[PDB]
């Protein structure tokens, strides 16, 4: 349109007015992605990018939003000539989807920082011709909606986005980049990534959005950061209000990371009358088990982060052990570096800091430590084992660093008499290792004295010692 009914709430004068606009669109046949993203982007522009407004909330006048909306839709409609792409009866062709992706891609500024903040929305695309990676995929979907292509939907993994189209969403197409300067796979399917068991494509258990999940995505995509020290509290509150609206309407049911995002917000600002963060984290894991075969990593990472912030050492290590149990059924590929870096920091920064604080109290003489709990030691081992198994599914190993020095250190935080209580059982607390690297370490892990050189040899597959 804009249709008449889409315009009656303007001007938007408050974050509550924005929520009413999302509620109205979520009540329609198909919520208007372009309208909603433009509004979120406009508000974020004046609360996070250029804070020049003279009122608390940057009043959103219909004349401004309508002009931006008409600019987008006319750009897309003028550049994508549907007459050239006969549609098979509610089915978009791969050429048509590629054409929409090319129109978005070719409109982007030739040079900018692609990981800058606040370039996620259609407001940034229209005013700045800049988008970040997943913002390109979202803009393709909004453009397809504007063109009447009801079968084109956003597909989301835990670190990438693309589109699905055709009957039941059976065709996939890459429409944006991943990482930096990698392949130009635009227009290809994701079948190779699915078949290779790379985490980036979730073995095919990725999210296939309907339009209301596409609204949930843009709300998660809100970035309240003003700088590295300061968030906009008004943006955070808007994002939290919008996530509760989607929650109430049932649209986070199949969106684990949105439930974790909402829990993280509730931790900073508990909404009176709403469930606790811990309930939300477990709902996210429950969603991942129900809809995605328990193939997602972040539901457990959200939970581990919570337990870590609250110093529940046992429960953090349990959640990290669960994260590794998910990752072990993937095969490491270079495109998976983002989750690799997260595991690397957990192993080499987060866990050492937690166990160091535990060790200091225990050294003073205080009993009942997590360091005295063989279930805790077993979770630490399962965490390493899953990461090793993941790596073993790759082609070329050589994953240096972090791993050996802090593995040895973390092992030594537990006394021999605790480590010795874990039973490591082969198939065909109790632990079964899946990785060949940890299977070979079993007797080194329960020695009274941790043999640092032998453990490093085994973890690095180094076969030789210093000549002298």
Ligand X SMILES: Cc1c(CN2CCC(Nc3ncnc4sc(CC(F)(F)F)cc34)CC2)ccc2c1cc(C#N)n2C[C@@H]1CNC(=O)CO1
Instruction: Name the site residues for ligand X (rule: CB under 6 A).
Output: 134, 156-161, 220, 257-258, 261, 298, 301-302, 304-305, 342, 345-346, 349-350
Taking the C-alpha atoms of residue 268 and residue 373, their distance in angstroms, rounded to an integer, is 31
DSSP state of 462: -
Nearer to ligand X, 335 or 373 (CB): 335
Taking the C-alpha atoms of residue 246 and residue 240, their distance in angstroms, rounded to an integer, is 10
> Which of 255, 105, 252 lies closest to 173, judged by CA?
105
Nearer to ligand X, 262 or 445 (CB): 262
DSSP state of 47: I
Nearer to ligand X, 179 or 275 (CB): 179
Contact 152, 136 (CB under 8 A): no
CB of 156 to ligand X, least distance (A): 4
Which 3 state secondary structure label does DSSP give 255? coil
CB of 304 to ligand X, least distance (A): 4
> Which of 183, 150, 186 lies closest to 168, judged by CA?
150
Taking the C-alpha atoms of residue 87 and residue 447, their distance in angstroms, rounded to an integer, is 68
> Which of 453, 192, 159, 464 lies closest to 335, judged by CA?
159
Q: Beginning with the edge strand found earlier in the chain, give each strand of the sheet holding 153-156 in spatial order.
A: 171-173, 161-165, 153-156, 207-208
Taking the C-alpha atoms of residue 17 and residue 2, their distance in angstroms, rounded to an integer, is 18
Taking the C-alpha atoms of residue 454 and residue 383, their distance in angstroms, rounded to an integer, is 20
CB of 413 to ligand X, least distance (A): 18
Using alpha carbons only, how large is the chain's radius of gyration in Å? 25
Nearer to ligand X, 6 or 323 (CB): 323
CB of 8 to ligand X, least distance (A): 31
CB of 77 to ligand X, least distance (A): 26
CB of 328 to ligand X, least distance (A): 17
CB of 378 to ligand X, least distance (A): 19
CB of 316 to ligand X, least distance (A): 8
With a CB cutoff of 8 Å and minimum separation 6, the contacts of 166 are: 91, 92, 151
Taking the C-alpha atoms of residue 204 and residue 329, their distance in angstroms, rounded to an integer, is 13
Nearer to ligand X, 158 or 391 (CB): 158
Nearer to ligand X, 143 or 446 (CB): 143
Nearer to ligand X, 217 or 433 (CB): 217
Which 3 state secondary structure label does DSSP give 361? helix
Nearer to ligand X, 161 or 411 (CB): 161
> Which of 157, 155, 255 lies closest to 263, judged by CA?
255
Nearer to ligand X, 134 or 145 (CB): 134
- What would the two tokens of residue 51 be? 């804070």
> Which of 341, 323, 416, 331 lies closest to 374, judged by CA?
416
CB of 134 to ligand X, least distance (A): 3
Nearer to ligand X, 320 or 332 (CB): 320
CB of 62 to ligand X, least distance (A): 30
> Which of 358, 332, 357 lies closest to 344, judged by CA?
332
């Amino acid at each position: 349109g804009l249709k008449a009914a889409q315009k009656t709430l303007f001007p938007l004068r408050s974050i509550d007015d924005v929520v009413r606009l999302f509620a109205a669109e979520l009540g329609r046949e198909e919520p208007d992605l372009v309208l909603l993203s433009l509004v979120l982007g406009f508000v974020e522009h004046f609360l996070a990018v250029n804070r020049v407004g003279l009122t608390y909330f940057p009043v959103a006048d219909l004349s401004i939003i309508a002009a931006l909306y008409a600019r987008f839709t006319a750009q897309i409609r003028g550049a994508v000539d549907l007459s050239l792409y006969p549609r098979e009866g509610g089915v978009s062709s791969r050429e048509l989807v590629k054409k929409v992706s090319d129109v978005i891609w070719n409109s982007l500024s030739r040079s900018y920082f692609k990981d800058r903040a606040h370039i996620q929305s259609l407001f940034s695309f229209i005013t700045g011709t800049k988008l970040d990676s997943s913002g390109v995929a979202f803009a393709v979907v909004g453009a397809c909606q504007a063109l009447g292509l009801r079968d084109v939907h956003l597909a989301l993994s835990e670190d990438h986005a693309w589109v699905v189209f055709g009957p039941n969403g059976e065709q996939t197409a890459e429409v944006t980049w991943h990482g930096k300067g990698n392949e130009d796979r635009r227009g290809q399917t994701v079948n190779a990534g699915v078949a290779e068991r790379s985490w980036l494509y979730l073995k095919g258990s990725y999210m296939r959005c309907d339009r209301k999940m596409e609204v949930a995505f843009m709300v998660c995509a809100i970035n309240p950061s003003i700088d590295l020290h300061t968030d906009s509290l008004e943006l955070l509150q808007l994002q939290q209000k919008l996530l509760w609206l989607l929650y109430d309407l049932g649209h986070l049911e199949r969106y684990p990371m949105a439930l974790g995002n909402l829990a993280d917000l509730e931790e900073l600002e508990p909404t009176p009358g709403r469930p606790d963060p811990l309930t939300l984290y477990h709902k996210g894991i429950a969603s991942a088990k129900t809809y995605y075969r328990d193939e997602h990593i972040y539901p457990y990472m959200y939970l581990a982060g919570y337990h870590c912030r609250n110093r529940n050492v046992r429960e953090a290590l349990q959640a990290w052990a669960d994260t590794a149990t998910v990752i072990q059924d993937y095969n490491y590929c270079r495109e998976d570096e983002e989750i690799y870096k997260e595991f690397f920091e957990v192993a080499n920064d987060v866990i050492p800091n937690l166990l160091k604080e535990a060790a200091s109290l225990l050294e003073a003489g205080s009993q009942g430590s997590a360091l005295q709990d063989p279930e805790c030691f077993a979770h630490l081992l399962r965490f390493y084992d899953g990461i090793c198994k993941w790596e073993e599914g790759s082609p070329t190993p050589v994953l240096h660093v972090g791993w050996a020095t802090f593995l040895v250190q973390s092992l030594g935080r537990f006394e021999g008499q605790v480590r010795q209580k874990v039973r490591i059982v082969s198939v065909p607390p109790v632990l079964t290792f899946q990785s060949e690297k940890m299977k070979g370490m079993k007797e080194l892990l329960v020695a009274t004295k941790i043999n640092s050189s032998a453990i490093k040899l085994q973890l690095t597959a180094q076969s030789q010692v210093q000549m002298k």
